[PDB]
């Protein structure tokens with residue numbers, strides 16, 4: 001099946017003619033490349049709505065901000081295989097890494113995409129997941145209990161509180177990644193010694209026009225979560241790992257001149273004003289990351305096959321939401 | 331011509347939501363929209379900012395709205411890629427009901443303009459550029475015979491009710507189309523042709539003569555409407571274009587087309603076309619020997635002239651199917667006969 005996708009969609013030596021588990025499709029080591037065709041490709045089997053993700057991946061491939069698109073078919077797609085590794089959670093805090101993510105995020109934000117520019121994504125998704133959460137019934141007594149504790153916060157009332165806080169919080173609408181976590185950041189092989197070009201932002205499943213503060217606040221929230229933990233619930237949460245004001249300022253001091261052209265040419269006092277207001281903007285939007293992903297995770301506990309403690313994760317996001325509300329005095 | 335109130339409201343919402351700058355804060359009463367192309371399939375509209383409104387950034391003053399089975403996914407990706415490589419109109423917005431694309435001030439070429447040496451040479455260069463494209467689609471040349479077999483299977487099942495359509499179908503069927511498809515298959519089997527990304531409908535109605543550029547000898551045209559595009563034999567794309575010289579679709583009375591076999595390009599006109607196509611396609615071409623260049627050229631004429639037979643066959647079958655399924659007024663059965671008449675005339679000329 002994959003043999004016929006790689007044979008029919010790929011040029012040169014493939015048109016004549018190895019697979020590993022996502023799939024790593026390759027040509028034999030003794031086979032000589034006829035031209036610029038790839039020796040090793042990546043196959044993505046799935047399992048509007050595909051029209052938008054496809055056009056987006058095609059555009060990012062064309063603009064070199066994503067992996068190349070080699071083939072597109074109903075069952076999935078053939079993409080460029082990038083020799084790399086994903087970053088770990090502890091590396092998000094590294095100054096060079098943090099500064100590069102901010103630059104790669106700033107670049108992604110300035111991109112013009114053929115999608116709805118109305119920032120509906122944030123609240124529309126939260127309402128969609130909230131409507132589902134209130135009608136979910138679990139069979140297991142342990143899950144019924146965990147849900148009962150989450151529903152006890154009165155989620156529709158909390159959403160209206162978050163709505164009022166965010167409406168009185170100006171944040172520009174940009175093309176957001178919406179999932180800027182370590183698992184979506186590639187550390188490029190060989191390029192490890194590069195100070196400012198060793199990374200790549202990937203996996204645009206959630207990308208849309210959204211409030212800038214959500215992409216930044218959401219990334220700040222991601223410093224607290226490590227999804228590599230090998231024992232149940234298959235994640236580790238650490239509130240103390242949220243960026244300090246200094247680490248948050250280092251991130252924005254790299255984000256701002258990379259996004260706003262004039263920024264560098266402003267006065268020291270003016271630069272601090274934009275920055276101080278930006279810390280308020282992103283820390284408020286961090287609350288929407290906890291809320292969005294917390295609701296998402298309850299819906300995921302009901303529908304997903306994947307081995308992950310979804311209900312514990314929802315509780316860890318809701319704990320962080322209330323902790324962050326307290327920190328902000330909101 | 332103004333659209334229907336429901337269309338005008340939906341169009342206004344798509345423009346204010348997908349288009350940036352002055353569009354984001356436009357009132358319904360400030361929205362300008364007019365029909366470009368009517369019908370039921372692919373309605374076209376020009377949408378615009380009032381002339382009194384200033385632009386804020388680099389947003390367009392006017393756009394084209396195109397108002398329309400996952401062939402929609404591939405078609406959308408194709409338009410996006412071509413828009414990115416500056417080979418098609420810019421894509422401003424994609425939604426289930428349609429697209430917002432760049433408005434290009436121009437007119438389409440007329441059939442008579444295809445023969446013009448400068449026009450012909452430029453079409454050859456843009457077609458050659460189009461063929462050098464790497465697209466993420468199936469590279470097996472299954473389009474041609476797959477489409478023809480698909481149309482033929484449909485044609486063998488067709489039962490018309492109108493007496494003249496019945497009589498016309500009887501004549502076409504009498505040629506023994508399945509047997510004729512096999513004769514065509516074996517002829518093309520012994521005709522080598524490189525598999526490239528083809529337009530597959532490179533006719534006058536899909537070529538834009540760009541406004542202001544009518545003095546630019548080599549850069550005044552643009553190929554558009556890539557709905558039939560796929561990986562196909564290079565022979566087809568060129569052969570199909572040569573067949574298009576014979577058909578004028580602007581005829582205002584039924585059958586809504588004029589066919590003239592004498593308008594097919596002469597060896598001279600074909601050689602002029604392939605003489606612009608070849609250095610545009612390989613770039614090292616001019617530096618080859620006179621005997622090698624003449625051999626490449628003579629093999630190329632034979633290849634495109636044989637594939638022209640598949641152009642006649644494919645559109646003749648498509649036309650019969652359209653007579654059954656389409657709602658658009660066109661003399662489809664007369665058009666099918668016109669393509670089959672040409673097909674047998676081209677067979678006799680090739681001595682095959």
Ligand SMILES: OC(c1ccc(Cl)s1)(c1ccc(Cl)s1)[C@H]1CN2CCC1CC2
Nearest residue numbers: 179181182183184227293296306307308
């Ligand atoms: O998709 C996740 C999943 C976590 C657990 C799952 Cl089961 S899917 C990640 C994808 C890849 C990772 Cl590595 S973590 C997380 C990343 N963000 C979106 C959804 C999750 C919370 C925030």
Ligand SMILES: OC(c1ccc(Cl)s1)(c1ccc(Cl)s1)[C@H]1CN2CCC1CC2
Nearest residue numbers: 531533534535536579580645658659660
């Ligand atoms: O699309 C057509 C149509 C003709 C009649 C129709 Cl009804 S659609 C053209 C569109 C615009 C033209 Cl100008 S010709 C023709 C161009 N090629 C594809 C189908 C037709 C034959 C070859």
